[PDB]
UniProtKB/Swiss-Prot annotation:
Protein name: Bromodomain-containing protein 1
Domain Bromo: 9-113
Localization per Swiss-Prot or TrEMBL: Nucleus; Chromosome
Gene that this polypeptide is encoded by: BRD1
Part of the whole protein covered: 555 to 674 of 1058
Assembly: Component of some HBO1 complex composed of KAT7/HBO1, MEAF6, ING4 and BRD1/BRPF2. Component of the MOZ/MORF complex composed at least of ING5, KAT6A, KAT6B, MEAF6 and one of BRPF1, BRD1/BRPF2 and BRPF3. Interacts (via PHD-type zinc finger domain) with unmodified histone H3. Interacts (via PWWP domain) with dimethylated and trimethylated 'Lys-79' on histone H3.
Amino acid sequence: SMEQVAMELRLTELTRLLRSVLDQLQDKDPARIFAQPVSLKEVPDYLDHIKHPMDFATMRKRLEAQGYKNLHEFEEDFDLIIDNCMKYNARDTVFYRAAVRLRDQGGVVLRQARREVDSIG
């Protein structure tokens, strides 16, 4: 149908906007701490602690399959990156501190993303 096409164009355009959001958030992680999944070879107990691992590569895979229907779903995944790190790692670690800085800096980017998503529809 023509409606299904129009819906698909909307999803494509959301995917375009989320790709730019993802790039801007990942720039706030210059150490690449959150770039890839925590290695289960290197942290073999990880899944005993963290039930839903997340990282920027995993988000990018979902994004490119157009697997984010709305901004809320994308934000859920970004918040998992931060929140998983802040639980597994202690306050006095470079990992925890990296997550706090990513959260704080990312907030700005996400605030305007929400306005753009609503504005453009």
